[PDB]
Structures are given as C-alpha cells and as structure tokens.
Amino acid sequence: EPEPQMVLSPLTSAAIFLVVTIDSGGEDTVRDLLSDVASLERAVGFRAQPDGRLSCVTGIGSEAWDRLFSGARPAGLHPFRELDGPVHRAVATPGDLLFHIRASRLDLCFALATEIMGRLRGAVTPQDEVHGFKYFDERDMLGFVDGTENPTGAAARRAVLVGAEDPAFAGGSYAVVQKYLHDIDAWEGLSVEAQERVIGRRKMTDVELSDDVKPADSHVALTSVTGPDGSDLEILRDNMPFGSVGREEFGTYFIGYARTPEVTETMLERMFLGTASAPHDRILDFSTAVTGSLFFTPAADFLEDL
Amino acid sequence: EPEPQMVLSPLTSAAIFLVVTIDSGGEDTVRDLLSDVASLERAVGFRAQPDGRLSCVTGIGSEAWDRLFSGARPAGLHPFRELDGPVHRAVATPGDLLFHIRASRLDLCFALATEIMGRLRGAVTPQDEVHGFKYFDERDMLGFVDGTENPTGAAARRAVLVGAEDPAFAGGSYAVVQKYLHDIDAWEGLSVEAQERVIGRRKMTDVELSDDVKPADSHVALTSVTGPDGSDLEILRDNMPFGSVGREEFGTYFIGYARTPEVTETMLERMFLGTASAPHDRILDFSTAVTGSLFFTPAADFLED
Amino acid sequence: EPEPQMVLSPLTSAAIFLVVTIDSGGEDTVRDLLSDVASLERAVGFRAQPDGRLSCVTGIGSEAWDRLFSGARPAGLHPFRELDGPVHRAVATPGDLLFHIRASRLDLCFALATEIMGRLRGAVTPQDEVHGFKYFDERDMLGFVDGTENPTGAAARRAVLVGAEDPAFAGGSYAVVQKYLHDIDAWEGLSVEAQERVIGRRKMTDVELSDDVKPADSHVALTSVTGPDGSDLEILRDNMPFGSVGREEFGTYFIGYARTPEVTETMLERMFLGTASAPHDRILDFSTAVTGSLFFTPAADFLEDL
Amino acid sequence: PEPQMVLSPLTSAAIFLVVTIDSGGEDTVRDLLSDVASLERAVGFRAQPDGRLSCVTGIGSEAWDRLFSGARPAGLHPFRELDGPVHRAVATPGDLLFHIRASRLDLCFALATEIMGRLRGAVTPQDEVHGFKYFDERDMLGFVDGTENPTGAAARRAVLVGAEDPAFAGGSYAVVQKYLHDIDAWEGLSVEAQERVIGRRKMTDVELSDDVKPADSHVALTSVTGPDGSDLEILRDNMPFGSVGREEFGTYFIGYARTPEVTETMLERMFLGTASAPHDRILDFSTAVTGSLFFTPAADFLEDL
Amino acid sequence: EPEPQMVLSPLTSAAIFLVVTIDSGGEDTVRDLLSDVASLERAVGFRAQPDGRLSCVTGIGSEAWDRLFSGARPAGLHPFRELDGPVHRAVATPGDLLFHIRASRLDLCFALATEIMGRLRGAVTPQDEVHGFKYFDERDMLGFVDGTENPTGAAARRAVLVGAEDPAFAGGSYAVVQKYLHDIDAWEGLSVEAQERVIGRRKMTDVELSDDVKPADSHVALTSVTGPDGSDLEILRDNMPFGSVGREEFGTYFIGYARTPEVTETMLERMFLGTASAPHDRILDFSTAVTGSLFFTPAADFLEDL
Amino acid sequence: PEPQMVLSPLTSAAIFLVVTIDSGGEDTVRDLLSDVASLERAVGFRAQPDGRLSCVTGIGSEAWDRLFSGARPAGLHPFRELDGPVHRAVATPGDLLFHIRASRLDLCFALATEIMGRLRGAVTPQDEVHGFKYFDERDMLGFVDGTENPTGAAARRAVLVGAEDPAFAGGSYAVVQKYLHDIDAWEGLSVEAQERVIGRRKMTDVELSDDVKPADSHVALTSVTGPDGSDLEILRDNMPFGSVGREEFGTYFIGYARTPEVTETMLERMFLGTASAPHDRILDFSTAVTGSLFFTPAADFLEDL
Numbered sequence A, C, E: 001e002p003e004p005q006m007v008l009s010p011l012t013s014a015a016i017f018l019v020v021t022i023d024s025g026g027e028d029t030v031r032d033l034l035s036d037v038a039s040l041e042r043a044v045g046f047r048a049q050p051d052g053r054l055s056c057v058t059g060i061g062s063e064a065w066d067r068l069f070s071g072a073r074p075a076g077l078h079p080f081r082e083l084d085g086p087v088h089r090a091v092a093t094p095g096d097l098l099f100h101i102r103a104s105r106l107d108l109c110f111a112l113a114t115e116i117m118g119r120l121r122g123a124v125t126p127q128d129e130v131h132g133f134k135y136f137d138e139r140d141m142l143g144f145v146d147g148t149e150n151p152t153g154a155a156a157r158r159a160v161l162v163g164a165e166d167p168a169f170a171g172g173s174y175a176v177v178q179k180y181l182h183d184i185d186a187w188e189g190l191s192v193e194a195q196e197r198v199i200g201r202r203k204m205t206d207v208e209l210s211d212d213v214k215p216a217d218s219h220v221a222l223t224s225v226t227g228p229d230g231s232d233l234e235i236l237r238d239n240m241p242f243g244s245v246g247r248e249e250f251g252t253y254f255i256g257y258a259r260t261p262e263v264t265e266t267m268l269e270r271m272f273l274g275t276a277s278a279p280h281d282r283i284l285d286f287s288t289a290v291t292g293s294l295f296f297t298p299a300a301d302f303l304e305d306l
Numbered sequence B: 001e002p003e004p005q006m007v008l009s010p011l012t013s014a015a016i017f018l019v020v021t022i023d024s025g026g027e028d029t030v031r032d033l034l035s036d037v038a039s040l041e042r043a044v045g046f047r048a049q050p051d052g053r054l055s056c057v058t059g060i061g062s063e064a065w066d067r068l069f070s071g072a073r074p075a076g077l078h079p080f081r082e083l084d085g086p087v088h089r090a091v092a093t094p095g096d097l098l099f100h101i102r103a104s105r106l107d108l109c110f111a112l113a114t115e116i117m118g119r120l121r122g123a124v125t126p127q128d129e130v131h132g133f134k135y136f137d138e139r140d141m142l143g144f145v146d147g148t149e150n151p152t153g154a155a156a157r158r159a160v161l162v163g164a165e166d167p168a169f170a171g172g173s174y175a176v177v178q179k180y181l182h183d184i185d186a187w188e189g190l191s192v193e194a195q196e197r198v199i200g201r202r203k204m205t206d207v208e209l210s211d212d213v214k215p216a217d218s219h220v221a222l223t224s225v226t227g228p229d230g231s232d233l234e235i236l237r238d239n240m241p242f243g244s245v246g247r248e249e250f251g252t253y254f255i256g257y258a259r260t261p262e263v264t265e266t267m268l269e270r271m272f273l274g275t276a277s278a279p280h281d282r283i284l285d286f287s288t289a290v291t292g293s294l295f296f297t298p299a300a301d302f303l304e305d
Numbered sequence D, F: 001p002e003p004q005m006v007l008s009p010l011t012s013a014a015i016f017l018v019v020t021i022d023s024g025g026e027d028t029v030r031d032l033l034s035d036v037a038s039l040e041r042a043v044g045f046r047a048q049p050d051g052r053l054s055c056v057t058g059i060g061s062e063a064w065d066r067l068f069s070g071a072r073p074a075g076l077h078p079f080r081e082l083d084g085p086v087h088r089a090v091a092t093p094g095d096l097l098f099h100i101r102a103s104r105l106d107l108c109f110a111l112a113t114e115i116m117g118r119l120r121g122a123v124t125p126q127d128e129v130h131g132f133k134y135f136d137e138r139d140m141l142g143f144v145d146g147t148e149n150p151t152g153a154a155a156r157r158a159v160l161v162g163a164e165d166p167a168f169a170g171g172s173y174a175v176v177q178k179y180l181h182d183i184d185a186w187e188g189l190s191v192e193a194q195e196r197v198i199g200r201r202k203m204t205d206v207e208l209s210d211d212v213k214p215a216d217s218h219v220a221l222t223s224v225t226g227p228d229g230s231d232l233e234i235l236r237d238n239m240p241f242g243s244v245g246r247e248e249f250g251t252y253f254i255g256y257a258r259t260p261e262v263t264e265t266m267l268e269r270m271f272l273g274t275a276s277a278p279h280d281r282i283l284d285f286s287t288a289v290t291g292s293l294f295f296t297p298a299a300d301f302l303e304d305l
C-alpha cells in the first residue's frame, strides 16, 4: 500500500474539529504546514504514549484543491451539495481545510491545534472550532449509544479507503462534516419508547428494534442502504457531542468517512428528502444542521512529499 | 459538626467554572437548587465511580448573600476589591453564584452543569463559563508545572477551612476567581532561563530557584508570605488552562481557596501593587485579569438546610 | 481503642455471601476460626495488593451468639422478625454465621472462602452461597443505579458503627441480609416511566423524582425515614446482582448495615406492611424475598481475642 | 471468509452455555444464529475497548442435521466415549454451545440473557458454568494454565479449517469437558509429586527437562507430533469454576482445533494410555462429567440465514 | 502529631537506598540539604501524581547526629551493635545519612536521588547504593511473599512513631538497614516443604504454619516477640530484592522501622545469637548480612526548621 | 517467517546482557538458543497482559562461525572501530546479546536469571545494564527520545531482512553502544544551546526549522537519504541507566536495521563528520565505552536446533 492517515482511529473521548478557509496568498504557508503535519502529530503525541492516542486527519476541499495542487483531482471531490428538502435543509458552508484532531484527553488535541494554527497565522480564516467530548458510555447528546454499527477491521478498510477505482489517490478518503444543534427540551418531552422509535434502537440496552416494528422514518431505517452489489453500503462515523450550558447549545458534530462521497450523499438525501415510505428522518425534527462541508483526506505519503 | 464541600479534591483533569448573577425574583428558585445541589452531584457522579471523581463546589457572593439569607454573614465576605496598580489592574466583575465543577472527564462536568442550569433557567443570567483542561504533566498554559507547593492533608484543612474563629460557618471557605488571558507570543519570546526568572522555579525539573538567585519580582517570591508569627501563609489553588485556537485565546483560570480572604488579598496586593523590592509580579507582564470575584463556599450541611 | 471490621469498604465489583449454621459440637472449631479470620484475609489478600481490595466481614446471629460466648450480648441482637404483610411476606431463614467477602475480583473472594470453609468443614452446614457481580455502571438487575444515596465518610461512620450507647460492643454493626428474586418478565412489561414510578428516580440519569410527582408507594418514598430527631435515618447497603440464565434466576442480594437494627427493621415494616398512604412497596410486586437473617458484626479486636 | 472470535485476547471471565433443541425449536434457533453477531455488538460496544466481549457459537452433530441440509463439515460427529481400564470420558447431550468471554462477568451475563431470551421455549439448558481466572492464570490445581498455547499465525494454522474442507473454511472444532477435581487427594501430594503429574514446575512454570519428565505426566501425553514431524497443536481456554458450599472445584476444558482428530488423539492418550503410560496422572485427580463436540462455523455462514 | 516523614508508605514497587558518610567540613552543606529535602521530594514527584507515589525518608546516624546538631539526642539513638553469634555474625558498617527513596517507578527514585546527591557533591562519600524492585506478587528473592504480617492503620502508627516517651522527637522513628546476599543454589536445593519450615509459612498460599508444626528455629517463630502485657511487638518492614545476574548477586535489602530500636534489636539477637530453643534463625543459613546501620528518621517539622 | 520481538510495544524496563562464549561452551549455548522462546513464555505468560516481556537474542560475527553449520547472514561482520579526528567508536567483545524488555524490571530479571542459569559455566559476562525509561520518554540529557522512530509497515520494512537474503528473512541487525554522559558539562549549556546540539526543542519536542537547524546537530547528521531519494531509517530503543553514587549517567543505544550499512553510515557521519560538520555535537557530551554488532535471527531459526 501507501500509508493512509489515521482515519481508522481507536476509540477516543476528545476531539477538536477545525475548519478554515485559505486567504489570498495563503497557499505557500499552507503547503509548508501540510508537509509537516505528520511530524507535528508525533512531536506533540509521542511523549504522551501510550494513553495519549493523539491523531490528526487533514482534509482539503474542492476549490482549495485547485489552488494548492496541479495535476489530477480525486475522482469524487466536489463542493458539498445543499439539500433543500420539503421541511428540512442540509446547508453548505465554506471550508478549505479540515483538521480532525482526536485523543484520549482534550489538552493533547489543543496542543496540536495550537501548533497547527501557529504555523497558519496570517494565511487562513477560522470558520468553525468545536471541542467535542464523548459521554462516559459512548452516548451522544440524545442519550443513545452512538457508534455501535460502525464497520471494523477489514470491512472498515474496504468501506473507507480509496482503492483501485482511483489509484493515484489510494489510501485517501472522503469526509463529510455537519454541525447539528439539538432542541433538547423537545427531545426530553418524548417518552423513552417514542425516542426509540425515532432512532430505531433500544435506549438502555442498545439492541436494534426488529424489522417488524422499526418505523420506516427511523434514523437507522433511513441510513441503511444496499448497493447495486446487494451488499450493505457502510460509512465510518465519529460523532461527538459539544455544547455550552450558558448559551443553551447542545450539539452533535457529525463526521462521516467513506471511499466515495456517493455513499454519504445518498444517506443524506434519504434523511433530508425522504423516500417513498418516509417524509424524512425523524431525528431532523430534533436536530438542525448549521454547517456542511466535504473534504478529501489524502494518503499520508501524499502530504509528506511537498 | 460539619461536612465541608469538596474543596480538597483529588487531582482532576477537567473543570467547568460557571458564574451567574441572580435576576430579580430569582431568589426562591436559587434557594431550592442550593438544597439539591449535593444530590445532583451524586446522581450524575455515582454511576461513574470510581474513575469519575466528579465534585461541585458552590459559592455565594457578598451581595447575593444578603438577598438569599438573613441572620449572620460570614465574617470575611465582601465584594472583590479592585486593585489599580501603577501598571497592572485587578478588575472586579459581577457574580452572585459560583459552581466549581471538577472531574476526571469533561462530559461529567457538563452533565452536572446541564442539570444545575436546567433548574435555574429563568432565575439567573450567565456571566462566565469556562471549560478547563489540565495538560498531561500538571503543566499550565505557560508550560510550567502548576500546583506543586499547594498544601496537603492536615496543612490544607488548616489553611482552607473556617474554624472556631467564625464558628457559625465552620467548614466553609473563601474562593477568589480571576480569569487570565496570556500574551503567548511575548512569553514564547523569552529564553527558558528568562521564564524561570519570571516564575521562580526551573521549567523542566520544577525545582525552586535558590534564595540567592530567585528574583524579588518573581511570582513565587511575591506569593510567599509569612504571618506575624513567622509561619508561611498558604492557599489552595486549582488553576486550569482554557482557550480557543481560532480566536487566539490562551488562558489560565485562577481559583484560590483560603480560610479567610485576607491571605488571598495580601498576595494579590503584592502582585499588583508591588513591594519595596518589586514594582509588581513579572507574571502580570504576560497575563491580564479580565474577571475578578469573591465567594463564600459554605459547609455542605448549611446548603442541605 | 477499637478497630471495626471492613464494614465501610470501597466500591468492590465482586462478592461472595456465605451463610452457614453451626452443627452440634461445632462451637470450638468456629471459635478458633473466628480468631484467625483476619489473618486468613491477609494471607490471601496481601499478595494482590493494592488492586485486590479483599475484605471479609464476619457476622454472628442471635442464637449462635449464646452458643459461642457467655457474657454480654450486643443490645440489638435478636432473630430476624418475619413480616406477614397483607400481600407480601418477609421470611426468616436459618443463619448462624455470615461471611461477607468483597474484592475487585471474584477469585480472591473464592480463595478466601475456600480457606474459611476448609477450616470449618465438619462443624458447619452451608445454608446459602451467592457469587455476586457488579452490573455495568453500578446497576442492579432492574436496570437502575443502586447505591447512589448511601452515606459516605463521617456520615457513614455514624450511621453504621455502634458507639457509646453499647460501649462493650462499640465498632460493631448489625447486618440484615435478604436474598431477592425478581420477575423480569413482568418488570420488562412496564414502560420506563412506570418503572421510574416504582423506584422513585429516573432510570437513565438517576435523578430523583420531585416531591411534585414521586408516588408514596415508590421504593425511595417508603425507605426514606426521619427519626424522632428530625434528622434522616440512613443505612449502608451493598446490594449485589446475581443469577443464572438457564434457571431464569435474576436476583438482588440485599445487605444493609446499621448501628441498630431498629432503623433497618422500620424500613422493612414500611415496605412489607405499608403506611397510612401506601399499601406496600411497589418494588415487592417484582421482587420476592426467599431468605432473611440478622447478624452482629463485632469489632475486629473482639474476634482477635478468643 | 471471516471466522468467529475463536482466537480471543486473554479474558478473565466466561460463561459456557450448553443447550439442546426441543422439537419444533429449529426455526427459532435459526433466527437467533443470524442475529448472534449483532447482539454481541449491542451488548459489547458500549464497554469498548476494555470489554473484550466475544461469543462463539457451536453446533453439534445431530443438531447440524436437524437445522441444515446438504454438505456437512467433514469432521463433525458426536463426541466419542472413551472406556479406559481405569478412567472414562463420558459423552453428554449438547446441540448448541455458546462460549461467551469478556473482561468482566456482567458483560457475559448480559449477552447470555439476551441469547436465552430469544430461545425461551425452543431449547432446554443442559449446562451453565460461570468461569473466572484465578490469580496469575492458575487453575484449580494451582498450576499456570495456558502457557504452551499457540499464538498468532501458528494458532490460525492450528485451529481454522482451510483447503482440506473448503466449503467450511473459517470454522473450527470445539471439544468441551467439565472436570471436577478431588482437591483433598491433590493437596496430599508434595509439590514435587504434583510437578511430576503435570510435567512443569509449580511456582515458575518452567517445563521439566526430558531427562526427568515422567511419561505419564500430562504434558508428556498431550505432546503429539505428526508423521511429518511437526507438533500437532490445539488452542485451549480452560476456566476454573466452583462452589465452596458443595466442595466443588472444577476446570472447564475447551479445546479448539482445525480437525477433531488432533483433540481426540490427545484424549485417547490421556484416557487409554500408551505403550509406556497407563493413563494421564492428572485423571487420578480429575473426573470428567460432561463431554461434547461442536463445529463453530465461519461468521459469514451464520449471517446468511 | 507533628507531621512525620513518609515512613508509612503505600506499597511501592521500586526503591533506591542511599547510605553516605559526611566528610570533614561537610556539615553545613548537609544541614542546608536537610531543610530542602521535602521540597525536592515535591518538585520531582508532583508532576507524576498520583501514579508516582514518590517518597523519601531521611535518617541520621548516632555519630553524625552529634556532628550536626546540638540540643537533645533521640533517646534510642546509638551505633548499630555488631552481633557475634556462634555461627552467624551481624556486621556493623559506617553510615551517617540514609535516604530511603520509594516510588511506583525507578526513574522517579533516580531523579530524586540525583538531585540529593547533586547538592551533596563534595560533602559526602557514598557507602551503599541499591536499586530495589518488587517481584510481581510481593515476593522476595527466596520466592516467598514478603510483607504479609506488617501492621497497618493505627497499629502501625503505634508501632513505628515516637510518642510521649521522648516528646521532643515525637513523629520520628528508628530505621535499621541490613543488606543481605543469598545462596540461591543452596536454597533451590531444598524441597518446598523444607523451605516452608525455614520461613514458617506456606510458599504458594502464604498461610502461616500452625503452632503445632512450625519449627522453633523458623524465621517467623524467632521474629515473633511479645511485650510484658503479652501483646505482640511489631515493626514495619519494606524489604526489597536487588541483584546482578552477571555477578550472581541475589539479595534482600532489609529495612525495618520501629518506635524504639529495642524491638528490632531483640529480634536480631534471637536470629543471630539464638535462644534456649533455637540455635539461630534458619534463614541465615541462606542469607549473609554485609551491611548494618541504625538511623533516626525525625519528624518532618524537625528538618523544615534548621 | 516469524521474527523475534524486535518491534515491541513501548516498555519501560530493560536488561541488556552481553556475554562471550568460553572455549568448549558451544553445545550449551546451542541448547539454550533452542529453549529461549519457551523460557520467555514460562516467565511471561503468568504476567499477561501487562507484563509485555520479550527477549531478543542476537549473535555476533565470530560466534556465528563457532556455532553454526552453513551460510552466514550477508551483513554480519565484527563492529568496525571508527577512529575519528576527535572521537572514537570502540569495538568491544560480545558473542551473545539478550535484549530483554518488559513493563517491569522484575520480569526482565527473572528471565535473565533463567537464561544465565542455563549458561553458567559456558559463557563469561561482559556487560549487564538495567535500564528504565523516564516518565515522559526522556533520556538522560532531558530530551524526548524515540519520536522519529518508524511505525507499523514502515518499521517492518526498515528492520526485517527480506528477499535480499532469503535464508535469513525475519532477522535483523542490532548495533549496541553503551554511552556515558558528562552531565556537568551538559547542564552548563543554556536550553537554546542544547536544542542546537540535538536539533529539536526541549520542552515541546518540535523539530527546529531547516533554516535554524545546525549541520552538526544530531538530528541533522543522523538524517540520511538513500541513493533511492527516500529516507533511511533505523529502529532505536535507547534506555537511560546509571548510578548516582558513581556519578554514572548513561544512555544505552540499541538500533535495529535490515542491513548494518544504514546504522554504520549514521555512525560514520557522527564520528568522522561530513562536508559541513566536524562530528556530531552530541559526542561532545557522550562517550561510547562499548560497541558490538549482532544478527537477531528469525524465531523459527532458533527453535530448530
């Protein structure tokens, strides 16, 4: 192979998501940083082994790709597509670079973020900064276990990493991000049985509701899709809660990785636009998307060589 | 008698500091919450034993004290006193309640803060909310180990908890908070040897500089105070870094507990106003205080009733 | 002076409860063992320090007391008082000796139990043996967090240990054990909101229900008692799940320590016989007591000197 | 093809559940087999990564024929009784095996509860054992147990069906026997005598040298080389269990191998002896009270049902 | 109390023992260091809390005490007394200062030792340096669990700390050190049953041999001594293995603390000189003492204020 | 082909043992080599999983010739002395290397004891070092040590012999050098000067930028690009050691590579210098007192003797 970035990371309990745009003239500064970001990851992380588990995944948007590089583009790379649904909208917001920084402790994330933004001062404009924290039993802001059906091992490699279909960019992946805010008051007004019907799984035990009872507009129903192959289409997610109690913000930061954006984009269409049997994903009646961006996360080797 | 709040907490790596003012008419909602805050601490924390190490310490300001209660006031409770130094200023900012929430993980802090603010929606106005994280070798935002000379065990009990000198309020303590922002660019322009001269200890090994070489305007020099009998006056600190990379905010949230505010206030006067030997604490040449408040943290029993 | 047993133990995640009767002629063998039980706890436990957290608490029943010792009896010691409620029955079952063994691992518990019983074979007859385990995040078999409102530190010392009121036995405590079996099918038939009404706290978050809403026949309602003093009366509980899936046994092993049995017995009367405003504790509609015994757990120095 | 979790990390707790399928139970069983992987995830995922919950499902010979039609695994037959001059290996009923392992008992128990909940009415329990690791991987006779198990690629090659039965590649054969030990007898031997029974040193777990290791020692009789001269290996995960009230001290034996021929050879040598050894001396202190053989299919085989 | 030094330490798995003599003219350097040793302990240790468990206990010998201080002497302070037995001899070797440094990791021990010896360069001459490590189940070099019968809690405070019998020096203790080397070949030639008869406990299970079978010349027999009341006289031990495989050195570094040396010295006389019943402690047939020193470890306050 | 445990997890304790084979000792050493894997398991198994005990056994050039029938690994020769204008890399005797690592020194010692137990009489100790990692991966000079080692596939490729010497695939080449430091001298430097010697920042471990990194910095000289254009990498596991009484503060260097050409190049650069650098400045505070090269065979090689 070539070495991929740390897309398949161990379970980590803290994250920083940084989205920036590249200012006029910024391209050179950015190119230098990209070639050093792996060694900054080691500088910050190595001394905190082995509990640290610090990783940084760097992604580049469609328009930024063309400013930074010439030659081939990854096959799937385009701007995030707005979805204007009957009721709900998936918005598009600007973002040229993504840093998805993960570790077992927030401070490690922050130390690496500090170093990266230190090198980019003057070249970039911050668009989003989120400090995420996992709840102690892998629960999210809605109180459900979040992560359970993610693929693992070889299945994950198959679902997430670009291969032979675009061989110049093998080891890469496509990341979609959306920042969601929740109406927790509304959510907390449902009974548990009602909430389970929205998600499609049991709250306490995390056992999937049987097909005979799981609503067609439940989240798990609409995000299960089968390919042309008859095989299930999979993504790798690492959703993180965030918020502020003083400003009444409670949020889920969605990030989904896939070997092609077509998979992630299909799931999004089903959620926002609905199907024959479902107006839309019921989870969107409690969750509003306020950002939306798409990035390509190259193989590690690609970045080293600049 | 009394169970104190969890003022002497184990080392914890995450904190939420929440400072609020009480709206007119809010007093009753607040009173109910104060009587329940211990049981919220257990509800959220008990199931995360024993790694969770969740605690909440609740403090009440001088003006709010008068709105909430009648009868005795704690002897030492007054508003934070501004210090207008020749060069540096310690400001005073509004705050009626303090929640000092600590645990081994941020999410536990957040869950408890959510519960508290949920019960207070409509009664209070948030003034400050800070999510702190300790760096992995007890270092602070300036890269120095932070906490080393805090008292422990019986020395800490003696330094922090109100006793027989104000017996109605035994088990209590006085908390001073200041939010500091640092000029990291300036700081990182000093050599390590220069930084050590600012703090008064060695950066990598955390060994105190010897008396013959420690500057008089170093931080450790100015915050060492001896009482009339010649014994050292101590406080208990739990400084936490915080920040945002995007907005270039790099901060230290200072919190100091003491059995009387006179100790904390003296150290502050020495830092801001100087001594014969020292114009001011050199650490203030890299650190600006943007909040300042004083609270009394009652014994736990006091709140139960 | 006196050093209590390890009644106030840290949280431990395994236990063995062993209840035996003394055969005729067994008294001398039991007396020798009682003087050695602390040294066996060291023999087994010391090598697994400090993770091990092995503790054995030894309790003696009312009629056993008279066969083993002459001199003073602890003031509160009598047989367990059977409760014959309108609906639900707290039975009293034989028990001369209790060994309440706790540790962070079952094998340490088992090792100690093996050594104790090895010395006592010939002289005792086992009546009950339960291997208990912690379930998830301090949850019991009904899926609720169990322990939350126990007292801690000074408050626990005062609620549990005999003092000046019985000075010959200061450092002692009274233990009540009852093995409960649950009807899981019935219980799972309830909505979560209905279950929360039975217990009197929220299931997921373990927040207590407000006075505004807490039923009077909720468990938390009936087991809250304020003394003549105006102060609450507290016990220390360390309930352990146990069971067998093949036999459909799902259980809670209740053990509660108190400085006098009057406290424990009142809570039991409220639960089984009811109050002015509540027939009986609704928890008993899904929980059957099949054992019941009371024991005195002497101070450690009492046992040493035999 | 993805195998089941036969090669598991070291785990300190286990539940072994053996059941028979009632008449008419076959359809309920087939549904459960297709869901058992997702129950494993539901129960286990929230305790990652310390949980290490795994369930291996095995199917007996007669049950295989009730549940499926067409080709059978080449090696699948009922456990063969061994009627030795002194010691006997009995065969007991069992159609399905759930070998559930984790770092904590409660994860095992939660998964067993879910499985048996789906099978209520279709199956009858024959055996349920809750096993625990004892100290430092010791068994109930006080010896370290596991030391010579194969690891990594050697283990993959010893336990997984391959080319020799390609329709069932990814599978394995599990033999289970529940043993009870006569501890009184055992503890009457000196340590040196016990070492001669096992074939290794008690405290250090170093193998006895070939010049002193008896031919009727356990390690001697269970070391078997093929005609090509290579060692024939199995993967074991013996677990202690017991009840102190009943004076029951046991070892639950489970051995996995790519063909039952390997496991069965070792068994014949233990029970029936060799030219130079009447039987395995360990059987003078260990009685088998169960005996069953199961085929543990590749994971994909179960998914597609 | 006055604050004692960390004589009662948790179980720690690494130690450095440093014994030095003070050169002529060294006295002042030494006095400065003694007043700073607690703050060096915090500097080195604080950043590794709470896994670190670094402690240093500082002791002063008889002749050094007179060079360093005027005022009272601790009542019990004298040079270690050589014991010239019929077969075995307890030697006395020079030592003015003892640093007993303990932590969960060797590097913390070493960092503190480096700081201390750095301040004393020029003033002192090293006599003994041992780096000790605990075997993984609290076993010593002879393969027995070592530490089992040590006192804990209040019993330990009573056994080790000076009180009202020498009130000027309350909070202090007396440390005896001896470095032993073992004849492992001889030892390994005994059966386990024979080794158990030497020590007086069971090897694998660490259960004491019963009084009716424990030999009078076993180690546990000769180091059990009762005071006038018939109460056991106890010390606190923290023996540490050490060794060098290339030089065939396998050793136990003995350190025992007591409130008066009379107790420790009694046990030593019994071991080396024997009694009416026992020629000498059989453990000495496999263990040779090559050092011997006695130190007083003052209360921490005493060192602060010089 | 199964390698030894060259690529180990991070371990915080080590023993390095170097011996020579006495005349006539060769049969004894051959026996031990065939058992050393089973001794690693005897001692380590019971301490799973925290123990992480591993033993890597290396054989020198002249020992190879005395011990083995046929072909030699391509790269095996005696360590070549380097006689630089200022600093000298000495070559010292050593036939056998045991590189023992674990999370705790007692496991290391136990295994070392057992090995030397079998070898007493047949070998002569030349060096024995008990190493321990500082609490944040620091070496005796106070710098983080290990940061740029390769990982995973990159490491597998830089360390393990492949098809270029197919009889010995799975093997590796180890160079050891024991270094003693002049701490007094080194502590005389400012932090900025020390950073110039190493080529990275002290506290943060960030590499100095190319326009500030000296050419005689350690990181500068031990960066080597092949004829390939690609970086040439070794795998290091340097361990501090020492004795405070004797004023010895040391770094035990061990580097593995798939050919010694890589390690030897870096050594020439350090000791003999380049176009723009007299020698590695680190050698101005570090004296090598040993030097040997060994071949560490595949595990399978040793098993079959």
Ligand code: HEM
Residues within 6 Å of the ligand: A140, A141, A142, A144, A145, A146, A147, A148, A149, A150, A180, A199, A201, A219, A220, A223, A224, A235, A237, A239, A252, A254, A256, A264, A267, A268, A283, A287
């Ligand atoms: C708005 C906040 C979101 C929350 C709180 C959330 C939460 C959840 C939860 C609780 C599950 C069930 C457990 C699990 O398998 O992780 C789940 C499954 C999943 N979610 Fe989401 N989700 C969100 C948004 C999204 C989006 C935007 C997508 C796709 C673009 C997505 C894709 C999935 C997928 C594919 C599954 C698994 C389906 C399967 O079971 O086979 N999620 N999510």
Ligand code: HEM
Residues within 6 Å of the ligand: C140, C142, C144, C145, C146, C147, C148, C149, C150, C178, C180, C199, C201, C219, C220, C223, C224, C235, C237, C239, C252, C254, C256, C264, C267, C268, C283, C287
């Ligand atoms: C089936 C047997 C039992 C189960 C499963 C059970 C479970 C629980 C649960 C879930 C709670 C709420 C959380 C907490 O521990 O504070 C609780 C509280 C309590 N239980 Fe029980 N319990 C049982 C039997 C008993 C018995 C037999 C007694 C007394 C004799 C008792 C006394 C208490 C007390 C005093 C409280 C706390 C009330 C307060 O909030 O002040 N329990 N129990």
Ligand code: HEM
Residues within 6 Å of the ligand: D139, D140, D141, D143, D144, D145, D146, D147, D148, D149, D177, D179, D198, D200, D218, D219, D222, D223, D234, D236, D238, D251, D253, D255, D263, D266, D267, D282, D286
């Ligand atoms: C009856 C209870 C059993 C006990 C307590 C027991 C115990 C042990 C112990 C202590 C060892 C040595 C350490 C090790 O390598 O794990 C061992 C090795 C072994 N046992 Fe058993 N065992 C039992 C039954 C069985 C059975 C029924 C079989 C095979 C059918 C078996 C096969 C093996 C094998 C293959 C080895 C490794 C031999 C080698 O060193 O190459 N065991 N057992």
Ligand code: HEM
Residues within 6 Å of the ligand: E140, E142, E144, E145, E146, E147, E148, E149, E150, E178, E180, E199, E201, E219, E220, E223, E224, E235, E237, E239, E252, E254, E256, E264, E267, E268, E283, E287
């Ligand atoms: C080679 C030196 C030594 C070794 C290897 C050794 C080893 C042991 C062992 C294995 C035990 C039994 C377990 C325990 O309670 O710790 C023990 C007990 C004891 N040792 Fe030693 N020991 C040594 C030297 C000494 C010396 C020199 C003394 C006293 C001056 C001493 C005093 C004791 C005492 C007081 C006990 C406990 C007695 C009681 O059981 O009530 N030891 N030692």
Ligand code: HEM
Residues within 6 Å of the ligand: F139, F141, F143, F144, F145, F146, F147, F148, F149, F177, F179, F198, F200, F218, F219, F222, F223, F234, F236, F238, F251, F253, F255, F263, F266, F267, F282, F286
């Ligand atoms: C006194 C002996 C030594 C000390 C104290 C020492 C210390 C260090 C330190 C602090 C680093 C920087 C952090 C890192 O990347 O690990 C480093 C890097 C390195 N050292 Fe050394 N080192 C020593 C000897 C050697 C020797 C003898 C070699 C080679 C023969 C060597 C090869 C390397 C290599 C290859 C690197 C990384 C180069 C890169 O940055 O790409 N070291 N060493």
